[PDB]
Write an enzyme that holds these catalytic residues in place. Structure first.
Site, PDB file in Angstrom:
ATOM      1  N   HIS A  66       0.814  -1.302  -0.213  1.00 41.59           N
ATOM      2  CA  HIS A  66       0.140  -0.055  -0.127  1.00 41.59           C
ATOM      3  C   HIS A  66       0.808   1.181  -0.048  1.00 41.59           C
ATOM      4  O   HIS A  66       0.191   2.364  -0.047  1.00 41.59           O
ATOM      5  CB  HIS A  66      -1.117   0.109   1.002  1.00 41.59           C
TER       6      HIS A  66
ATOM      7  N   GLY B  23       3.105   5.906   9.956  1.00 43.43           N
ATOM      8  CA  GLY B  23       4.443   5.858   9.564  1.00 43.43           C
ATOM      9  C   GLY B  23       5.111   4.442   9.868  1.00 43.43           C
ATOM     10  O   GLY B  23       6.138   4.207   9.622  1.00 43.43           O
TER      11      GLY B  23
ATOM     12  N   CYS C 141       3.941   1.359   9.371  1.00 44.44           N
ATOM     13  CA  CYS C 141       3.893   0.473   8.390  1.00 44.44           C
ATOM     14  C   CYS C 141       5.128  -0.024   7.958  1.00 44.44           C
ATOM     15  O   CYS C 141       6.047   0.632   7.782  1.00 44.44           O
ATOM     16  CB  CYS C 141       2.938   0.720   7.402  1.00 44.44           C
TER      17      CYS C 141
HETATM   18  C1  LIG Z   1     -10.516   2.932  12.947  1.00 42.98           C
HETATM   19  C2  LIG Z   1      -9.114   2.632  13.274  1.00 42.98           C
HETATM   20  C3  LIG Z   1      -8.925   1.834  14.493  1.00 42.98           C
HETATM   21  C4  LIG Z   1      -8.379   4.079  13.389  1.00 42.98           C
HETATM   22  O1  LIG Z   1      -8.503   2.022  12.102  1.00 42.98           O
HETATM   23  C5  LIG Z   1      -8.173   2.413  10.810  1.00 42.98           C
HETATM   24  O2  LIG Z   1      -8.905   3.237  10.395  1.00 42.98           O
HETATM   25  N1  LIG Z   1      -7.373   1.625  10.388  1.00 42.98           N
HETATM   26  C6  LIG Z   1      -7.012   1.663   9.044  1.00 42.98           C
HETATM   27  C7  LIG Z   1      -7.784   2.378   8.107  1.00 42.98           C
HETATM   28  N2  LIG Z   1      -7.299   2.404   6.502  1.00 42.98           N
HETATM   29  C8  LIG Z   1      -6.009   2.071   6.378  1.00 42.98           C
HETATM   30  N3  LIG Z   1      -5.336   1.449   7.389  1.00 42.98           N
HETATM   31  C9  LIG Z   1      -3.913   1.107   7.227  1.00 42.98           C
HETATM   32  C10 LIG Z   1      -3.518   0.838   5.660  1.00 42.98           C
HETATM   33  C11 LIG Z   1      -4.435  -0.473   4.960  1.00 42.98           C
HETATM   34  C12 LIG Z   1      -3.895  -1.126   3.808  1.00 42.98           C
HETATM   35  C13 LIG Z   1      -3.843  -1.719   5.090  1.00 42.98           C
HETATM   36  C14 LIG Z   1      -2.881   2.176   7.684  1.00 42.98           C
HETATM   37  O3  LIG Z   1      -3.396   3.227   7.793  1.00 42.98           O
HETATM   38  N4  LIG Z   1      -1.629   1.624   8.240  1.00 42.98           N
HETATM   39  C15 LIG Z   1      -0.515   2.545   8.723  1.00 42.98           C
HETATM   40  C16 LIG Z   1      -0.499   1.873  10.257  1.00 42.98           C
HETATM   41  C17 LIG Z   1      -1.488   2.393  11.130  1.00 42.98           C
HETATM   42  C18 LIG Z   1      -1.927   3.699  11.253  1.00 42.98           C
HETATM   43  C19 LIG Z   1      -1.957   4.033  12.708  1.00 42.98           C
HETATM   44  N5  LIG Z   1      -1.571   2.902  13.373  1.00 42.98           N
HETATM   45  C20 LIG Z   1      -1.365   1.986  12.589  1.00 42.98           C
HETATM   46  O4  LIG Z   1      -0.972   0.760  13.055  1.00 42.98           O
HETATM   47  C21 LIG Z   1       0.324   2.560   7.813  1.00 42.98           C
HETATM   48  O5  LIG Z   1       0.303   2.092   6.309  1.00 42.98           O
HETATM   49  C22 LIG Z   1       1.630   3.389   8.052  1.00 42.98           C
HETATM   50  N6  LIG Z   1       1.922   4.057   6.892  1.00 42.98           N
HETATM   51  O6  LIG Z   1       1.953   3.434   9.103  1.00 42.98           O
HETATM   52  C23 LIG Z   1      -5.565   1.390   8.656  1.00 42.98           C
HETATM   53  O7  LIG Z   1      -5.000   0.720   9.699  1.00 42.98           O
END
Ligand SMILES: CC(C)(C)OC(=O)Nc1cncn([C@@H](CC2CC2)C(=O)N[C@@H](C[C@@H]2CCNC2=O)[C@H](O)C(N)=O)c1=O
Ligand SMILES: *[C@](O)(C(N)=O)[C@H](C[C@@H]1CCNC1=O)NC(=O)[C@H](CC1CC1)n1cncc(NC(=O)OC(C)(C)C)c1=O
Lengths: 305, 304
Positions: free
Chosen positions: B41, B143, B145
Site C-alpha cells: 500500500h 508511519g 507500516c
Molecule cells: C478505525 C481505526 C481503529 C483508526 O483503524 C483504521 O482506520 N485503520 C486503518 C484504516 N485504513 C487504512 N489502514 C492502514 C492501511 C491499510 C492498507 C492496510 C494504515 O493506515 N496503516 C498504517 C499503520 C496504522 C496507522 C495508525 N496505526 C497503525 O498501525 C500505515 O500504512 C503506516 N503508513 O504506518 C488502517 O490501519
C-alpha cells in the site's frame, strides 16, 4: 494505537559487549574506545566474595590474568585500574563500533533499557526503572554481571547502570559507569536489604495519560482535588509525594488530553480508594509506575534515533 | 532471578531498516541482500485506499517512483514486483549488514519481538504474541507500516511479521514476509473486526512455572485434575483447550520444578474459579499469557 513497555533499540550497545574472564569467573564488559569496563568482583574467587580486599586482590593480578574476548577475537590487555567498584582494562585495540556516548548517574523514578548479556553475548532487552529505594526489578541470572542499562538521548548513548548483584526479594543492585553504587549497597556477599519500596506517583499519572491517549477512559471522573489532599490520600497507599514540579512536568500531557493534572489526580484517588472493580487499564489490573512522562510522549509521538 | 517481558536484541534487524517513499506515502522497508520488502500500500494515495486495484496501481509505477533511503544513502531501484500484500524492490546494492535470516509463518500463541520504526529509523523494541484471533497487541502510529517482527536463534533472524494496519479495538494486523495476512484481514480501508480473543493457556502455565522458579509458590495446591476436567473449566473462561502437545512442550519446566503439568492445571483451575484473592504473581494481578514455554526457559536459563 497501543501502549507497550518499550525498550530502546539495542544495536549501538550490542556492538560494545565483550566477555571478561579472570580465573574461574567470566562476566560481561563494556568496550568503549580502548577501555573495557567491568565489575571489579571479576577478580574474586567465590571465597574472596565474603570479605574481599580489592586493592590487595588486584595488585596480585597481571594483565595476563584477564582474558577479554570480542566475538571470536581475543583482545590483549595492556593495563588495568580500579575506579570505585569498576575495573577498567586498557586494551591494545579501540572498538571500531564505539558509539557517541556519555556516563550519567540517574535519579530514582527514571527509566532505562537493560541489555542482558551472558558470556559477552546479548540475550535480550527490557525496560527498568530506578526504584525509590535504589534497586531495580530486573531479570538477571548468574553470568549477567556487567550487563548495562542505558538511554538514547538525541545523538548519544547514555550509560547509567552496570549490573553487580541480587538482593532479598529478587531485586537488583548496581553501579553507574564510574563504579559508584546506586543506594547504600556494597560489592560483597553479605546480608544486605533494601528500604521499603514505594510507588512512583508521577509515573502512574503519566501512564493514566497514556491510557487516555489510547482511548481508555472509563476511570475519568468529573471530580477534582487539591495537591495537598491528594498527597494525604496517596501516602496511605505507599505512593511517593507528588510535588509541584511533578505537576508542572505533566503539563504537556495535560494539554494534549484536555485533562487537568489535578483532575487526573482525583481519578487516581478514586482508583486507590475503590479499586478497579475487575476492570483493566491498558491491559493491566495494577497501576503501572515504570513509564515516565517523557517515556509516554516518546512512545505516543513516535520519537526515533 | 526476576522475570521481565524481554525482547530480542534489535541490532541485527536495525541494520536492515530503510525508508521507502512513493509519491506522498512514506513507510518502512526491510533491506535483505539486494531486495527491499515493504507493504504494497506504499503505492496508494488516500483516495485509492477505499478499494485499491493494486495490479494497476503497480503497473503505472516505474522504478524511479520508489525512493529508498538507507540512512544518508539513496538506493537505486532496478526492479519491482508484488508478492501477495508485499512489494519487493530490487536494488543495485546488497545490504552488507544482512544477517543470516529466514522467513517463517508463526502460529497463534507464539511470541516475537517488534522493532517499531518511523521514516526507516528505529524507535523502540517490544515483545508481542500472535493472538488466537490473529491480531497482535502492538504499539504502532502512522508511519510504522513496514516495521517487522522477528525471533533470533543463534545468529539467525527469523522474520515472522510485517506491520500493515490498526483495527478498531486498538489492535494490529499484518502479514508474514511472503505477504500473506495473518487472519482474515485485507489491505483496504474497509470496516474490519478482530472479534473475540481467547487466553493462551499453555503460555499461562509456562508463566506459572516461571513464578515457581522465582519462588512465588502460594498458588500451588494439593488438588488434582484431568486434561478433560481442566478443559471444561478452561473453556468456561475462554481459555484455549490444553492439548497433549501442550502438555509435552511444558515437559522441561515440569521437570525443572518437579510440578506435574496437570498439578499446575489444578492450580490454574483454582485461580480461574476463585481469583488471586489480593495476591500477585510475578508482580501481576492478571494471569499473563504472552510468554511461551521456550521464552520462560530461555529467560530462567539465560541463552544468548
Ligand atoms: C478505525 C481505526 C481503529 C483508526 O483503524 C483504521 O482506520 N485503520 C486503518 C484504516 N485504513 C487504512 N489502514 C492502514 C492501511 C491499510 C492498507 C492496510 C494504515 O493506515 N496503516 C498504517 C499503520 C496504522 C496507522 C495508525 N496505526 C497503525 O498501525 C500505515 O500504512 C503506516 N503508513 O504506518 C488502517 O490501519
Ligand atoms: C554476578 O557476579 C554475575 N557473575 O553474574 C552475579 C549476578 C547475580 C547472580 C544471581 N543474580 C544476580 O544478579 N552477582 C553476584 O553473584 C554477587 C557478587 C557480589 C557483589 C559481589 N552476589 C554474590 N553472592 C550473593 C549474591 N546475592 C544473594 O545471595 O542474594 C540473595 C540474598 C540470595 C537474594 C550476589 O548477588
Amino acid at each position: 494505537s497501543g501502549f507497550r513497555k518499550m525498550a530502546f533499540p539495542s544495536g549501538k550497545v550490542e556492538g560494545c559487549m565483550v566477555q571478561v574472564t579472570c580465573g574461574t569467573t567470566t562476566l560481561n564488559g563494556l568496550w568503549l574506545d580502548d577501555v573495557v569496563y567491568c565489575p571489579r568482583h571479576v577478580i574474586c574467587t567465590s571465597e574472596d566474595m565474603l570479605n574481599p580486599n580489592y586493592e590487595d586482590l588486584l595488585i596480585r593480578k597481571s594483565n595476563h590474568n584477564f582474558l577479554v574476548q570480542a566475538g571470536n577475537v581475543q583482545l590483549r590487555v595492556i593495563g588495568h585500574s580500579m575506579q570505585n567498584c569498576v575495573l577498567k582494562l586498557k586494551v591494545d585495540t579501540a572498538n571500531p563500533k564505539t558509539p557517541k556516548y556519555k556516563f550519567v548517574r540517574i535519579q530514582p523514578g527514571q527509566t532505562f533499557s537493560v541489555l542482558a548479556c551472558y558470556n559477552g553475548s546479548p540475550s535480550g532487552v527490557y525496560q527498568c526503572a530506578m526504584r525509590p529505594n535504589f534497586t531495580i526489578k530486573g531479570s538477571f541470572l548468574n553470568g549477567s554481571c556487567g550487563s548495562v542499562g542505558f538511554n538514547i538521548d538525541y545523538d548519544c548513548v547514555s550509560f547509567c547502570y552496570m549490573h553487580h548483584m541480587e538482593l532479598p526479594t529478587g531485586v537488583h543492585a548496581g553501579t553507574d559507569l564510574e563504579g559508584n553504587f546506586y543506594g547504600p549497597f556494597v560489592d560483597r556477599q553479605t546480608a544486605q536489604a533494601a528500604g521499603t519500596d514505594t510507588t512512583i506517583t508521577v509515573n502512574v499519572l503519566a501512564w493514566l495519560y497514556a491510557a487516555v491517549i489510547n482511548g481508555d477512559r472509563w476511570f475519568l471522573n468529573r471530580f477534582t482535588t487539591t495537591l495537598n489532599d491528594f498527597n494525604l490520600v496517596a501516602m496511605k497507599y505507599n505512593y511517593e509525594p507528588l510535588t509541584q514540579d511533578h505537576v508542572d512536568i505533566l503539563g504537556p500531557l495535560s494539554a494534549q488530553t484536555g485533562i487537568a493534572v489535578l483532575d487526573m489526580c482525583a481519578s487516581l484517588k478514586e482508583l486507590l480508594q475503590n479499586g478497579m472493580n475487575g476492570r483493566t487499564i491498558l491491559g493491566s489490573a495494577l497501576l503501572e509506575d515504570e513509564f515516565t512522562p517523557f517515556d509516554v510522549v516518546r512512545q505516543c509521538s513516535g520519537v526515533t534515533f
